[PDB]
UniProtKB/Swiss-Prot annotation, chain A:
Presence of keyword Isomerase: no
Molecular function in Gene Ontology: ATP binding; ATP hydrolysis activity; chromatin binding; DNA replication origin binding; helicase activity; zinc ion binding
Function according to Swiss-Prot or TrEMBL: Acts as a component of the MCM2-7 complex (MCM complex) which is the putative replicative helicase essential for 'once per cell cycle' DNA replication initiation and elongation in eukaryotic cells. The active ATPase sites in the MCM2-7 ring are formed through the interaction surfaces of two neighboring subunits such that a critical structure of a conserved arginine finger motif is provided in trans relative to the ATP-binding site of the Walker A box of the adjacent subunit.
Protein name: DNA replication licensing factor MCM2
Domain of life: Eukaryota
Residue window of the full protein shown: 201 to 460 of 868
GO cellular component, one term: nucleoplasm
Swiss-Prot record, chain B:
Subunit architecture: Assembles into a complex with MCM5/CDC46. Interacts with MCM10.
Gene: CDC45
GO biological processes: DNA replication initiation; double-strand break repair via break-induced replication; mitotic DNA replication preinitiation complex assembly
Full-sequence range covered: 326 to 650 of 650
UniProt protein name: Cell division control protein 45
Additional detail: Present with 1730 molecules/cell in log phase SD medium.
Assigned protein family: Belongs to the CDC45 family.
From Swiss-Prot, chain C:
Subunit structure: Component of the MCM2-7 complex. The complex forms a toroidal hexameric ring with the proposed subunit order MCM2-MCM6-MCM4-MCM7-MCM3-MCM5; loaded onto DNA, forms a head-head double hexamer. Interacts with CSM1.
Entry coiled-coil feature ranges: none
Domain of life: Eukaryota
Family of the protein in this entry: Belongs to the MCM family.
Task performed by this protein: Acts as a component of the MCM2-7 complex (MCM complex) which is the putative replicative helicase essential for 'once per cell cycle' DNA replication initiation and elongation in eukaryotic cells. The active ATPase sites in the MCM2-7 ring are formed through the interaction surfaces of two neighboring subunits such that a critical structure of a conserved arginine finger motif is provided in trans relative to the ATP-binding site of the Walker A box of the adjacent subunit.
Native organism: Saccharomyces cerevisiae (strain ATCC 204508 / S288c)
Other comments on record: Present with 10300 molecules/cell in log phase SD medium. Early fractionation of eukaryotic MCM proteins yielded a variety of dimeric, trimeric and tetrameric complexes with unclear biological significance. The MCM2-7 hexamer is the proposed physiological active complex.
Segments traversing the membrane: none
Protein name: Minichromosome maintenance protein 5
Intracellular or extracellular location(s): Nucleus
Classification of source organism: Eukaryota, Fungi, Dikarya, Ascomycota, Saccharomycotina
Amino acid sequence: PNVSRTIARELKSFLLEYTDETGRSVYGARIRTLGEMNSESLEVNYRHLAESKAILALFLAKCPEEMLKIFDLVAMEATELHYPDYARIHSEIHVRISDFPTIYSLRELRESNLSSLVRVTGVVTRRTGVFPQLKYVKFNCLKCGSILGPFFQDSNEEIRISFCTNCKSKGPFRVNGEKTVYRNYQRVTLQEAPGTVPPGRLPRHREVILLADLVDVSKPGEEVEVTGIYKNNYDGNLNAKNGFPVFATIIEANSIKRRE
Amino acid sequence: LFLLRHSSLYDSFYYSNYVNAKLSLWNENGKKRLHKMFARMGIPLSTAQETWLYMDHSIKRELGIIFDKNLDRYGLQDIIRDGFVRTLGYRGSISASEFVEALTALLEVGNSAQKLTNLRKRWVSNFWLSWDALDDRKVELLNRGIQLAQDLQRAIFNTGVAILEKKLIKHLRIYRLCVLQDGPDLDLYRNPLTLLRLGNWLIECCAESEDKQLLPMVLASIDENTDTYLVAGLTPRYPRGTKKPILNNFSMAFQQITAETDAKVRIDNFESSIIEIRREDLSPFLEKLTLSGLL
Amino acid sequence: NTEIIKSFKNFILEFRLDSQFIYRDQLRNNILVKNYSLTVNMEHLIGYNEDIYKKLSDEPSDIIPLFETAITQVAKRISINSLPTFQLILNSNANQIPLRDLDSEHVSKIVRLSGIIISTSVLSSRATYLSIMCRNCRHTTSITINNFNTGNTVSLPRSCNCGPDPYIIIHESSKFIDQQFLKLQEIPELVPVGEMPRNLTMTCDRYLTNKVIPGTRVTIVGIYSIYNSKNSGVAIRTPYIKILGIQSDVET
């Protein structure tokens, strides 16, 4: 919406003017721990935000796919008043929302938990290698120039952005290997913990995507606690099943905690 | 800084003196402040450990500019001086200070009583190894020197930390004392141009900008082979901000004691402020230093 | 593209240390033996000029095939018919990047590293200069490829209308080179306490084939590049190192 500019100025006071326990604002002493580890990750608790403003706590569970972009874009200009020469080191920060107790073990996932912040524990089974992703679709149009401006296909979607009327008509486009920003990628599946199984039933799998900071944080055999989101991945969802329009569901991860 | 042109940026900020004297890098509480500089300066921590040839064109262009906007807050403003640079064509630049380190480090490395003089012929024969390198024809002899210099001030910095955690300093009423008896690589410290390297790292460390006192140090290292105990008297300094020039007393007041008991001492140096002494003679000698104090 | 040849053509002719100058004596003694290469030490580039290495460090895939044609215009100032395109082999020593930390930032950048070679492959053929004729028009041409970015980056055109891709490769007038396809494993003294040792696959050009036996300790200077075959994900590429210059040790 266009109400976002009212949101940008009014959560910025909860990065600077939120203090607790006789001074030492915990998100003024947090950005100084960025830089000296140089790690583009702000830790943000959920209890430290929900007690102040109950409006934005609702707007995390409603639609965090458009909420976290604005919560990242102003997160740059919080550091910029501390480290003014930080445009050239990753130029980007994404955020690390803490505990929100929604789902108990694994199997409470209905329609009513779609596209919402879910927290879930489990056990890592197996994991693939580390690969690069595109993140910046840059065309190879023959009629226009081969720089053509930055366009975004950054999802599990693989957008069908056709090149029509580029310079004089629809120029045929491909992808090159030039000047785009790749990022990491690693799929790791996860199954149910053997301590909290109901009697008789087999454990269930689920696929989890990690992205761009949290690769090589797992090891097979760990009690991992994922706080991702929950979406509806297309691109080959039961290709031999068109009489049953049945969609594939992948958790995109937003944080990883170890056993506690 | 020490050896900018032939090492990285980050590896010069460790093994310095006027950065270590103002940020106290031997502990852990100061090493967090060092990365806190490179955040403000706009230098990543991958670039800042690449060697100084392979840094970008638009960073060595802007080193004279970033060193004056962000260097004020940590007190380091006595960093930029004026120095000399001798380029021999297509080879590359070597300053003046970065040449005298490669000659103080080519004078001890890189080569009973008759075990002593077999060492002194290893120093006299080492003297011609710098006499040739001073010229402009042999540069393959100089670049042996620089890579023999960084492994000198990496072995000093790992000893000078191990003193300032255990705190082996006696804080006596006249001077300060330290006696080193055990540790790694104690073979290096038989050369008088190696004790004065470490002792110069301790004087600018504790006798710092922070006023505690102003007292001389007395060092004493040790090896095996009849327990030589190379002691060396040092001097105090000011933190560069020059009225008292006398600044030494360890020639006179020391000389009276060696003609009092003459208990196994030899004065065998160009300088009168460094001797050897046997191991059984260390304890009754030091008590006499506190008596008849001339300072 | 333009005049960056002349900024490199003066580097081979005029670089000179104290008395005897190297790149006109390494280019002449590698023609009489019929060796057809050159070895550039990479510290001597940035001592002579910094603006050249600024271009080479940023975008290396488009400039090293411009230096390969800047050599073959100099070897015709010495020999005076068949002089092929020369090959550029370079070596340096800045700082080793360990094999475990190769992020997504080092795509198309000069990177050196180290390790142990597991296996090799059988040689192959890649085309450099081929001759095309159309089936209906019979209009001859000649495509000369010199850049190397493994599947397809330069292909046949679509018209000289005529049909979809009317072009035929003629096998009677061309030139070919070799490829080697190694594999490289990290050194086990950078121990993976809870991991297995990873590996990468390299390529080699015409004059680095059959140089190294499996089981050695090498240091490899190359371009960390990417290729997109399907030979398991969405928009996923795969990494590989295009070797230009293998500085092995003494083989022992």
